Amino acid sequence: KAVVIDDPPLRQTPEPFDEQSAYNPQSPIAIDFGSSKLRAGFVNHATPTHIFPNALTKFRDRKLNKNFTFVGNDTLLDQAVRSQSRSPFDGPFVTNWNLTEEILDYTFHHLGVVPDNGIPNPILLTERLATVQSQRTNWYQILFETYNVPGVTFGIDSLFSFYNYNPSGNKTGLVISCGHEDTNVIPVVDGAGILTDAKRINWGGHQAVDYLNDLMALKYPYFPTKMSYLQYETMYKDYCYVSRNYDEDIEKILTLENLDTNDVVVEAPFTYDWRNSILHLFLRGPRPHDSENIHEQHQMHLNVERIRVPEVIFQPTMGGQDQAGICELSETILLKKFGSQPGKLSQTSIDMVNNVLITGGNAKVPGLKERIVKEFTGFLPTGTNITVNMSSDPSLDAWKGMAALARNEEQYRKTVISKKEYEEYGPEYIKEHKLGNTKYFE
Amino acid sequence: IYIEANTGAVKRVGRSDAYATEFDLETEEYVPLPKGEVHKKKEIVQDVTLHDLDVANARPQGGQDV
């Protein structure tokens, strides 16, 4: 029985506004400017108040009043408003900027804030790894000129999640993130993100969905209906998993005893034996094909691409970039850095092994934890206890981390930026604190 | 490789399956990794007759290699 794939349904109920009576000017505000989803919420709560993707557009009427400022969740109302949606992210950086304060003013209005002469709430903000000086400079300029905010901090989402999942602040572990466009491996030693040995991989969820798009476009060049990006990310979400061992699984993926189980057919919406043919098994699975009926011309099969696409974080070579996979960078971090001979592990190495944490929005795929535990038992000396932790929803943990830094502790005022300090020092500044970026030089 | 610590026997099995793609065509044989532990212990009972010990010490030409 075939399953049809449609666009996700539009949200009937528009997002609400917070009450102006319960707003507190002294309460800090936490914003996560993620690439895929924007996370915001007040410190006093623990459940996320506003969750919506960072995208927006402009509408044109016949009656010509120019009153359309639709941001995010109100683009989930019709196909026409959703189709022309423009995001502020171009690659890993932000290029356009007028849409950014338009989105931020939408967020501030939906937070139920009535300010005067600027926002009188300090800002908790998340920022990437090894970020360029122009991005930090115009972030400084945009908040401390447009919003007149007294205090701001900078931090990484992976270290924020690590501070969430061990709130003492002086632990030691290894954090691996799978972001929307990047995969990062950061070692943490005594609660400090050691950025001189952190590593970055240029692959994420967006590149995986685009890889599936290119693969399925190259598999069926005569598909009459053109599919959108959204249907692609849902069949990437629904029907992709990480193999336990790749070399054995590809060797029997088109075998008849295996192809009857894991072959997924996909129906597009609309209004000399074949058994010995490896091409026919790769195209249309274990079923015979007749190309005259209308139904199977709109059909799409997923047999090897269930595990081919999520593999590429372990081997980036089929993705195109000449980088190592997270097995090898995790191995060289654990075995040739922080004073570790290959064969003898330091106490820091063993303590990082005992506290491996994996976060990120792209960790939703199944089989990641079993694979990482299996290969960590692979390359390590025998008898070493390996512990890997997982969140139920790993896209919530970073905002909860900055909320933990604000509400849970009082030493958050170590890392804040004063306006007077900004005016005495300038844009060229970075606080060398335990949980964010460091200085570009020594 | 294959190391027997009690005897000192050294045996080469072949190259790994991970090094199978350094060349398209190679003269070496590629085996997978051993699925068990590196160190294995096994108790054995050896039966020899007196004639084997007589013929082991009475080789006229000399000893032979493995």
Binding site: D90, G91, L129, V132, Q323 | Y19
Partner: protein
């Protein structure tokens, strides 16, 4: 007023800024730049 400032040329300006600071200091060891956290090539074939 600001330029469109596409994300491709930002890498080039950051690279030439780092190189200019390096050759000014020469005639400073980098610790955490965008070209140092980026991953080395693999060793396994």
């Amino acid at each position: 007023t600001r330029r469109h400032k596409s994300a491709r040329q930002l890498i080039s300006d950051e690279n030439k800024r780092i190189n200019a600071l390096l050759t000014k200091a020469n005639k400073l060891v980098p610790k955490a730049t965008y070209f140092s956290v980026e991953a080395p090539p693999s060793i396994r074939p």
